[PDB]
Amino acid sequence: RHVRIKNWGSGMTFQDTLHHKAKGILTCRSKSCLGSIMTPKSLTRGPRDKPTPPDELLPQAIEFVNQYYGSFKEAKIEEHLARVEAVTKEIETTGTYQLTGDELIFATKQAWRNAPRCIGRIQWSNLQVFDARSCSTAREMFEHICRHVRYSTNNGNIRSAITVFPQRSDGKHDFRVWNAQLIRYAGYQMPDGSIRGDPANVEFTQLCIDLGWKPKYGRFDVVPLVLQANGRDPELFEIPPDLVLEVAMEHPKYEWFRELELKWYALPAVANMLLEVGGLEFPGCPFNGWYMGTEIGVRDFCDVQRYNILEEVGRRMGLETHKLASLWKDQAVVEINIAVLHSFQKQNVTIMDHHSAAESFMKYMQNEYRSRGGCPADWIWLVPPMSGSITPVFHQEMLNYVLSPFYYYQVEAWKTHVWQ
Amino acid sequence: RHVRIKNWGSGMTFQDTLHHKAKGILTCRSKSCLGSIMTPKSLTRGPRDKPTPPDELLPQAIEFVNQYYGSFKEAKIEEHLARVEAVTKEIETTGTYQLTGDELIFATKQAWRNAPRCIGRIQWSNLQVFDARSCSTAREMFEHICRHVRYSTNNGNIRSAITVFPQRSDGKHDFRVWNAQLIRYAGYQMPDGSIRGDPANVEFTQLCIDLGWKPKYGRFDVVPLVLQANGRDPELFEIPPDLVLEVAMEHPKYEWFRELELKWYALPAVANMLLEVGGLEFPGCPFNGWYMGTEIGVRDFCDVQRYNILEEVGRRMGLETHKLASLWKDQAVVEINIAVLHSFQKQNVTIMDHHSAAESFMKYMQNEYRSRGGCPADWIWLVPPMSGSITPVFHQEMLNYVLSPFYYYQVEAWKTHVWQ
Ligand code: HEM
Ligand code: HEM
Ligand SMILES: C[C@H](O)[C@H](O)[C@H]1CNc2nc(N)[nH]c(=O)c2N1
Ligand SMILES: C[C@H](O)[C@H](O)[C@H]1CNc2nc(N)[nH]c(=O)c2N1
């Protein structure tokens, strides 16, 4: 069956067939689309207390292996059959199975390619994979991560990479990072009720405090790494500041911008997510790419629930911060975003403006429909927080669906973990 | 059952219950949400050739009457029962039924309140209703419409109103306006292949030409009214220009803006839609409200498929129209939108900036959850084409669902109508 989608901007039409290979697990339906939910249950992959049943793990396992060998140009009929055998044997004799080196690499890149919310998916083939399935202690996790950061930071020329930790076994020996991101600022609730720092990270910082970390009560304080190994209680590890590359915010024209004294980390890295590969689950798999202007400019800086500086710069620019129809809010956001890009460019740090990002995506999307006649896409997340209609993606009709491999959200560790 | 939704900006959470009263008719599902479709089949209410079967029309009819009487403060047990009787009788004795004066008024306001894509829904109670079910000829339709326009224009102080035409009977005697909007500019495909005017209205203008209207080949030419009465072939009626209030575009700071020589109509009026009320269908029901800055500024003027002037003003502003990372596109759109608002304000014509609109909506939404514990909302359509994250709606989680009464899209008349 073919489903027709059109890009009203260019008039270009696509025929999606890949939606069939998609598993029918969604929070929405044919009576109320749960489209607009931050974190639907369908995109979540909760914890378990019993290993994945061998009988149901097998179909998925085979399914994957086929997909893997299906990727190669010239079929390896020999190795293919050989692998399928080895796997089946392993599953019924051990209850689970291990992935080959190259299989993992393929899986990570594929899961990224299958992430409907990532706009930078044109880079899916360029990914550095760190095999840390051999890891066994919290400290080792820390060391692996530092290697990851050192690599990805690359002295400013950000590189995409992912560190894969031991797969989930029984669901009690989970290896996972509790931090939403490897690098993230602290958020403290001050005595007068006000909030200093990143408001969104208040609950998490509070946790760090409870675990022994002493608050520095500053606007840009990098939280410690909360590492959980083998399901054991987590341990804190401060990231060596030398590895934390930041960018000071300053506007090209407005010198008063420096006075706001803003900055931000260069490395966007999601740690709290789970990787699903042919039935297997990996609760610990941090991955990173590079920032997109708007993420910092619009979201991090302008969101009321975040640093919320819109009011301030509006006054600084001497705009009618009281007459909404003056569109002062808009000029402000634009200027703030220019500052962000400029600051990264001036400091030789990789950054990408939402316009270039969107155009790159359209290209990637077109390629997807040639390669596999499909491309899962969450319109709501792909259209930039500013100037939506000015980006081609805004006009592109798109289908959202879950494939495999895939990156699922997990339930915040502290909410389920049982303390020792 | 209660479904939880959160507004990540304010943290305020709602509990939706109204989704139950919603009919399970959606193009999306629990395997692929068809969220992102311009015009899903679920939102469409096609034509018919046989009257609505009395047996299936009855449940809906009763359903409505209950809803109608349920709106009143003090229950009219007497009249209620009386009405239910009268209706049932009428349906089985005539095959259909007529709505009372006040019932229609209620239905129109309710269907508006039930439109998940309208952001100006806070005004749902303020609506002027013109009963034109008595109408019988194309000419009469024209006269009723002119009355509507004269009223709504209100010399600049736009007022919301709707003109209801005779309900659909057998589906062959449909009374409907073919025009997407009452007032809309022409689009001509020039000899050199280029397009003059509103590109989106090319197909429709071509039709008008085929019907005898002679092209004026200008950028802002108001098309004639294509009126269909009793299912008969349509007839053209030029709208008296005195009734067409326009606004010349000029920027407060940039005097060169006047040189672009832009303008736009003050009255946004959807004509091509169908109203569904307790089983009944009305293919002819034009309704209007007032414009929102972005509609014209961002969409009408910047969309590539529309007037597409972004390139031009970028050069005029002397911006780096070649370096995307310069965010020239963004500064340009902001400036263009300021021009729009300014021009309306200066000419004493009702206009509403997207910021004020969004805030008003949040208020309305909250009220909805008190009144009926629910509010159908299409996030994709509610978030403004520019500065999305800067508007509260962007952060509001919302549920989309079809209720009744409701405003359904129809299949373009010319595509199905049978000529005489
Ligand atoms: C090449 C650089 C990349 C760019 C420019 C990019 C950009 C983006 C952007 C802007 C988002 C939205 C983030 C948000 O709103 O919270 C996103 C989300 C996402 N990206 Fe990418 N991405 C890149 C690399 C990666 C990599 C390397 C992976 C994985 C291997 C990845 C996986 C995802 C996933 C899973 C999401 C969803 C994250 C969430 O739910 O918060 N991205 N990406
Ligand atoms: C008070 C002034 C009003 C404002 C500011 C307002 C604003 C809006 C906006 C901005 C849209 C999006 C239009 C588009 O993107 O195509 C819209 C759509 C809609 N509005 Fe309202 N609205 C108002 C009045 C009305 C009235 C009076 C009705 C009906 C009785 C109404 C019914 C709808 C419907 C059905 C849609 C969907 C139209 C479509 O599919 O193109 N609105 N409204
Ligand atoms: C409620 C709504 O889903 C929410 O605000 C979404 C909208 N789109 C988004 N898009 C991206 N990329 N990132 C986000 O965090 C969000 N938040
Ligand atoms: C493909 C996508 O649905 C389409 O471009 C939508 C997005 N949101 C919209 N929102 C509004 N208000 N109006 C529109 O015409 C659109 N177009």
Coordinates of N, CA, C and O and ligand atoms in Angstrom, one line a residue, chain A residues 38-39 43 108-109 111-124 126-127 158-162 268 270 272-273 285-295 299 351-352 357 360 381-382 385 406-409, chain B residues 394, ligand 1:
Chain A
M38 N 4.5 15.5 24.6 CA 6.0 15.6 24.8 C 6.6 14.2 24.8 O 7.6 13.9 24.0
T39 N 6.1 13.3 25.6 CA 6.6 12.0 25.8 C 5.5 10.9 25.9 O 5.1 10.5 27.0
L43 N 6.4 6.0 22.8 CA 7.8 6.3 22.5 C 8.7 5.9 23.7 O 9.9 6.0 23.6
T108 N 23.3 1.3 15.5 CA 23.3 2.7 16.0 C 23.0 3.7 14.9 O 22.1 4.5 15.1
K109 N 23.6 3.6 13.8 CA 23.4 4.5 12.6 C 22.0 4.4 12.1 O 21.4 5.3 11.7
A111 N 19.3 3.3 13.9 CA 18.4 3.8 14.9 C 18.3 5.3 14.8 O 17.2 5.9 15.1
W112 N 19.4 6.0 14.5 CA 19.5 7.4 14.3 C 18.7 7.8 13.1 O 17.8 8.6 13.2
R113 N 18.9 7.1 12.0 CA 18.2 7.3 10.8 C 16.7 7.1 11.0 O 15.9 7.7 10.3
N114 N 16.4 6.2 12.0 CA 15.0 5.9 12.3 C 14.4 6.9 13.3 O 13.2 6.7 13.7
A115 N 15.1 7.8 13.9 CA 14.6 8.8 14.9 C 13.9 9.9 14.1 O 14.5 10.8 13.6
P116 N 12.5 9.8 14.2 CA 11.7 10.8 13.6 C 11.7 12.3 14.0 O 11.2 13.2 13.4
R117 N 12.4 12.5 15.2 CA 12.5 13.8 15.7 C 13.9 14.5 15.5 O 14.0 15.7 15.7
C118 N 14.8 13.8 14.9 CA 16.1 14.4 14.7 C 16.1 15.0 13.3 O 15.9 14.4 12.3
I119 N 16.5 16.3 13.3 CA 16.5 17.1 12.0 C 17.9 17.0 11.3 O 18.0 17.2 10.1
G120 N 18.9 16.6 12.1 CA 20.2 16.4 11.6 C 20.5 15.1 11.0 O 21.7 14.7 10.8
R121 N 19.5 14.3 10.7 CA 19.6 13.0 10.2 C 20.3 12.8 8.9 O 20.6 11.7 8.5
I122 N 20.7 13.9 8.2 CA 21.5 13.7 7.0 C 22.9 13.2 7.3 O 23.5 12.6 6.4
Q123 N 23.3 13.3 8.5 CA 24.6 12.9 9.0 C 24.6 11.5 9.6 O 25.6 11.0 10.1
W124 N 23.4 10.8 9.4 CA 23.3 9.4 10.0 C 24.4 8.4 9.7 O 24.7 7.5 10.5
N126 N 27.7 9.2 9.3 CA 28.9 9.7 10.0 C 28.7 9.6 11.5 O 28.1 10.5 12.1
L127 N 29.1 8.4 12.0 CA 28.9 8.2 13.5 C 30.0 7.4 14.0 O 30.4 6.3 13.5
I158 N 33.1 19.8 16.4 CA 32.2 18.8 16.9 C 32.1 17.6 15.9 O 31.9 17.8 14.7
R159 N 32.1 16.4 16.5 CA 32.0 15.1 15.8 C 30.9 14.3 16.5 O 30.8 14.3 17.7
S160 N 30.1 13.6 15.7 CA 29.0 12.8 16.3 C 29.6 11.5 16.7 O 30.5 10.9 16.1
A161 N 29.1 11.0 17.9 CA 29.6 9.7 18.4 C 28.6 9.2 19.4 O 27.7 9.9 19.9
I162 N 28.7 7.9 19.7 CA 27.9 7.2 20.7 C 28.6 6.2 21.5 O 29.5 5.5 20.9
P268 N 26.0 18.9 22.6 CA 24.6 18.5 22.9 C 24.7 16.9 22.9 O 25.0 16.3 21.9
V270 N 22.6 13.5 24.4 CA 21.5 12.8 25.1 C 22.0 11.5 25.7 O 22.6 10.6 25.0
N272 N 20.2 9.8 28.7 CA 19.0 9.1 29.3 C 18.1 8.3 28.3 O 17.0 7.9 28.7
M273 N 18.6 8.0 27.1 CA 17.8 7.2 26.2 C 18.2 5.8 26.0 O 19.3 5.4 26.4
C285 N 23.3 4.4 26.6 CA 23.8 4.7 25.2 C 23.8 6.2 24.9 O 22.9 6.7 24.3
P286 N 24.8 6.9 25.4 CA 24.9 8.4 25.2 C 25.3 8.6 23.8 O 26.3 8.0 23.3
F287 N 24.7 9.6 23.2 CA 25.1 10.0 21.8 C 25.0 11.5 21.7 O 24.3 12.2 22.4
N288 N 25.9 12.0 20.8 CA 25.9 13.5 20.6 C 26.1 13.8 19.1 O 26.5 13.1 18.3
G289 N 25.7 15.1 18.8 CA 25.9 15.7 17.5 C 26.3 17.1 17.8 O 27.0 17.3 18.8
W290 N 26.0 18.0 16.9 CA 26.3 19.4 17.2 C 25.1 20.2 17.4 O 24.0 19.8 16.9
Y291 N 25.2 21.4 18.0 CA 24.0 22.3 18.2 C 23.5 22.9 17.0 O 24.1 23.0 15.9
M292 N 22.2 23.3 17.1 CA 21.5 24.1 16.0 C 21.1 25.4 16.7 O 20.5 25.4 17.8
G293 N 21.5 26.5 16.2 CA 21.2 27.8 16.7 C 20.0 28.0 17.6 O 20.1 28.2 18.8
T294 N 18.8 27.7 17.0 CA 17.6 27.9 17.7 C 17.5 27.1 19.1 O 16.9 27.6 20.0
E295 N 18.1 25.9 19.2 CA 18.1 25.2 20.4 C 18.5 26.0 21.6 O 17.8 26.0 22.6
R299 N 15.1 28.3 22.4 CA 14.7 27.4 23.6 C 15.4 27.7 24.9 O 14.8 28.2 25.8
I351 N 28.6 24.9 14.6 CA 27.2 25.3 15.0 C 26.4 25.3 13.6 O 27.1 25.4 12.6
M352 N 25.1 25.1 13.7 CA 24.3 25.1 12.4 C 23.0 25.8 12.6 O 22.2 25.5 13.5
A357 N 20.0 23.8 8.4 CA 19.6 22.5 8.9 C 18.3 22.0 8.2 O 18.3 20.8 7.7
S360 N 19.1 20.9 4.6 CA 19.8 19.6 4.6 C 18.8 18.5 4.8 O 18.9 17.4 4.2
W381 N 8.3 18.3 16.0 CA 9.7 18.5 16.5 C 10.6 18.9 15.4 O 11.6 19.6 15.8
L382 N 10.4 18.7 14.2 CA 11.3 19.1 13.1 C 11.2 20.6 12.7 O 12.3 21.1 12.3
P385 N 11.7 26.4 16.2 CA 11.0 27.2 17.2 C 10.8 28.7 16.7 O 10.1 29.4 17.4
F406 N 15.8 1.5 17.1 CA 15.1 2.8 17.5 C 15.6 3.3 18.8 O 16.0 2.5 19.7
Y407 N 15.5 4.6 19.0 CA 15.9 5.2 20.3 C 14.6 5.6 21.1 O 14.0 6.6 20.8
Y408 N 14.3 4.9 22.1 CA 13.2 5.1 22.9 C 13.5 5.9 24.2 O 14.6 5.9 24.6
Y409 N 12.5 6.6 24.7 CA 12.7 7.4 25.9 C 12.5 6.4 27.0 O 11.9 5.3 26.8
Chain B
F394 N 2.8 26.9 21.9 CA 3.9 26.0 21.4 C 4.2 25.0 22.5 O 4.4 23.8 22.3
Ligands
HEM1 C1 24.8 16.0 13.3 C2 24.3 16.8 14.4 C3 23.0 16.7 14.7 C4 22.1 17.7 14.7 C5 22.3 19.0 14.0 C6 20.9 17.2 15.3 C7 19.8 18.0 15.6 C8 18.7 17.6 16.3 C9 17.8 18.6 16.9 C10 17.8 20.1 16.7 C11 17.0 17.9 17.7 C12 16.0 18.5 18.6 C13 16.4 18.5 20.1 C14 15.3 19.0 21.0 O1 14.5 19.8 20.6 O2 15.4 18.6 22.2 C15 17.4 16.5 17.6 C16 16.8 15.4 18.3 C17 17.3 14.1 18.2 N1 18.4 13.7 17.6 FE1 19.6 14.7 16.4 N2 21.0 15.9 15.7 C18 22.2 15.6 15.4 C19 22.8 14.4 15.7 C20 22.2 13.4 16.4 C21 22.9 12.1 16.7 C22 24.3 11.8 16.4 C23 21.9 11.3 17.1 C24 22.0 9.9 17.5 C25 22.9 9.0 17.2 C26 20.7 12.1 17.2 C27 19.5 11.6 17.7 C28 18.4 12.4 17.9 C29 17.3 12.0 18.7 C30 17.0 10.6 19.3 C31 16.6 13.1 18.9 C32 15.5 13.1 19.9 C33 16.1 13.7 21.2 C34 15.0 14.1 22.2 O3 14.0 13.4 22.3 O4 15.2 15.1 23.0 N3 20.9 13.3 16.7 N4 18.5 16.3 16.8

